[PDB]
Design a binder for this molecule. Structure first.
Ligand SMILES: CO[C@@H]1O[C@H](CO)[C@H](O)[C@H](OCc2cn([C@@H]3O[C@H](CO)[C@H](O)[C@H](OCc4cn([C@@H]5O[C@H](CO)[C@H](O)[C@H](O)[C@H]5O)nn4)[C@H]3O)nn2)[C@H]1O
Ligand SMILES: [Cl-]
Length: 139
């Protein structure tokens, strides 16, 4: 039913273009944050971080963490999440970027900074959600 957050989903042999990762959940009421962390060991290859109240604004912050240092942030002000509401996040790995759609609407893409895609072998899912489902498939 509801998975335990923080949740770790192993990605056997890392990611690869045409790999589709689907996260189903519901945002808690008065949520503060969501985070998806595609990890290469201790490094975070792709950090996807909806923030519900940063100086009274809603923003999605994306970044990469290498040897414990966060890089240059990429910010998107389109913010499809709402507290209390069910969502679907789809992360499709493409040759040059992660492509993210929420609720079947394209949201953003994030260019690969970590190059060893087949070593990005785990997805951490955390934040103020009830997590229903997390899975992957090759399309
Ligand atoms: C148009 O221009 C802009 O107009 C704006 C109008 O409000 C502001 O004036 C802008 O400058 C101020 C400003 C401040 N911040 C951030 O605000 C934050 C709290 O919401 C923190 O204080 C941030 O610094 C500490 C911090 C670090 N991290 C880590 O970031 C990682 C991803 O990179 C992961 O998410 C980690 O998990 C997370 O810990 N988190 N917090 C701070 O950098 N963003 N912008 C200005 O540029
Ligand atoms: Cl790399």
């Amino acid at each position: 039913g509801p998975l335990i957050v923080p949740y770790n989903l192993p990605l056997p042999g890392g990611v690869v273009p045409r790999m589709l990762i689907t996260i189903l959940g519901t945002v808690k009421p008065n949520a503060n944050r969501i985070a998806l962390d595609f990890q290469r060991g201790n490094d975070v290859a792709f950090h996807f971080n909806p923030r519900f109240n940063e100086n009274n604004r809603r923003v999605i912050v994306c970044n990469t963490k290498l040897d414990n240092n966060w890089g240059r942030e990429e910010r998107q002000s389109v913010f499809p999440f709402e507290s209390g509401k069910p969502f679907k996040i789809q992360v499709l790995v493409e040759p040059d970027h992660f492509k993210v759609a929420v609720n079947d609407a394209h949201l953003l893409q994030y260019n690969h900074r970590v190059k060893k895609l087949n070593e990005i072998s785990k997805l951490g899912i955390s934040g103020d959600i009830d997590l229903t489902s997390a899975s992957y498939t090759m399309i």
